[PDB]
Structure formats: structure tokens, C-alpha cells
Amino acid sequence: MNPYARGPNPTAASLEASAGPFTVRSFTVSRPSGYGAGTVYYPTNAGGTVGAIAIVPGYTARQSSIKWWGPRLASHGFVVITIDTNSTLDQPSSRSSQQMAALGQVASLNGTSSSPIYGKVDTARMGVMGWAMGGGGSLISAANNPSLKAAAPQAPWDSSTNFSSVTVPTLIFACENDSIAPVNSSALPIYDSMSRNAKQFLEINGGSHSCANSGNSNQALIGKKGVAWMKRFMDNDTRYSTFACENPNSTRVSDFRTANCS
């Protein structure tokens, strides 16, 4: 009866694998509207319309830093747009505006008959992700747009840590040994500020600032968690509640916290 459920029942193995059940294709956005560039990843065989997620990099960075999420998420039934910002030196607020413009363009493309994603998106179900300043931008997006269904920033940074206005289910990936956005002054205070939402804090043991980026050695766990979080909250899919809410009880995790999760 959940009209948003897609794919086979999940297992730890299926979520830890490099690829999900659906086949993925991608394209470059010809005329980015409000951001620098973008790549759209989508499932070719999901079986119904799926939600959309927009992912932004950190300061100085480009799509390569976050690109692994595209196929990883899309293969589980999401349309994912990874973006380059107008400038590599844009700040979090600007990143947030750009992230939201990218979701808007995904909505446009869903209504464009020549697009490969024509009619593949449920525009009412969206999510936001991003690294560092792009993670802070994701949190700003969530605060300003509470109709967003899920947020999952990584190693976030904002000059302000008060995200008490965020009511969107938010999973914060953190990196233990982050020296750019130290956990104790960035990710953790951000997590602690959020009081009205389902939330989770997952710190990778021994991780540098780039611990959740393309090429990381914890793709099994990080990808399982990201996908589970998005499935649970973007699709209201309670088949993923244990995966989304559980403490992994893993040696790869140096700090785990969660609240209001079901």
C-alpha cells in the first residue's frame, strides 16, 4: 500500500554492495539554471516515479568529490543531481540557493519531453546532501524548505551551528579527525542543535575531512546508511527503519548518536 516503495526488500548485503537493484544512466545538464554545472543520474527501471536528491561539493571542490553518490543512490531508486557551483569559492548560503535551483531544474526536466528523466520524478519528494560548505548549504536548504523529506550532509560546516529550525530528518556524517571542519565545533554542535526532527550522527573512525567522499574506504557502511536514510524518509519506506535507525556497532564508527528515529 505505500505508493512510494520501490525495489526488493533490503538486506545488509544488498545495501552494502556497490550497486543497488536498478540500472543507472546519466547525462550532463545542457543549460544549468542557477548553478555551475550538473550531472543527472537516474534509474532506467525503477517501476514508478522516484524522489530527487541534489548534492553539492565543498569549498574549492567539484563534482568528483561527491560523484560516487550518484550511481549509489540512483541504483536504489532516486534521481540524483550532482553539481558544480557557479564559483568554487561560493559560501554555504549561495550553495544552498544553488542546490535548490538544481532541484528545481530536475523538476523542469521531469516535464521536458526530450529529457531522459521525463516523467520519472515525483517532484513532491526531495532530498539534500553535500560536503563541508555544501553540507552546511544542505542544512540551510532544509531549514528554509521544511517540505524537503531528508537531509544527509557530510562533514558539514557553517559559520553558525544553530540549526534548531530544521525539522527535516537529518543524518550527519562526520569524520573523526577532520581538521577543516572539526567535529567538536562543527558537525556535533550542529547535530545537538536540532530538536524537532528524526536525526542521526555517524562519525567515521580515523576519518579525515574527505572521509565520505568519492574514493573513501567505507563505502559499504556510508552508502548503506545514506541509502537507508533516504529510502526511509524520502519514500516513507519502513522496510528501511532498522537500517536507518540502528547503531551499526562497528569499529569503523567512532561516535554514533540518534534521536526520534522510527
Numbering used by the authors: 0 to 261
From the paper:
Specifically, I. sakaiensis adheres to PET surface and secretes a unique cutinase-like enzyme that degrades PET. By hydrolyzing PET, the enzyme produces mono-(2-hydroxyethyl) terephthalic acid (MHET), TPA and bis-2(hydroxyethyl) TPA (BHET). The enzyme is named PET hydrolase (PETase) for its PET preference. PETase adopts the canonical ɑ/β-hydrolase fold, in which the strictly conserved catalytic triad S131-H208-D177, as predicted from sequence alignment with homologous enzymes that exhibit PET-hydrolytic activity, is found on the protein surface.
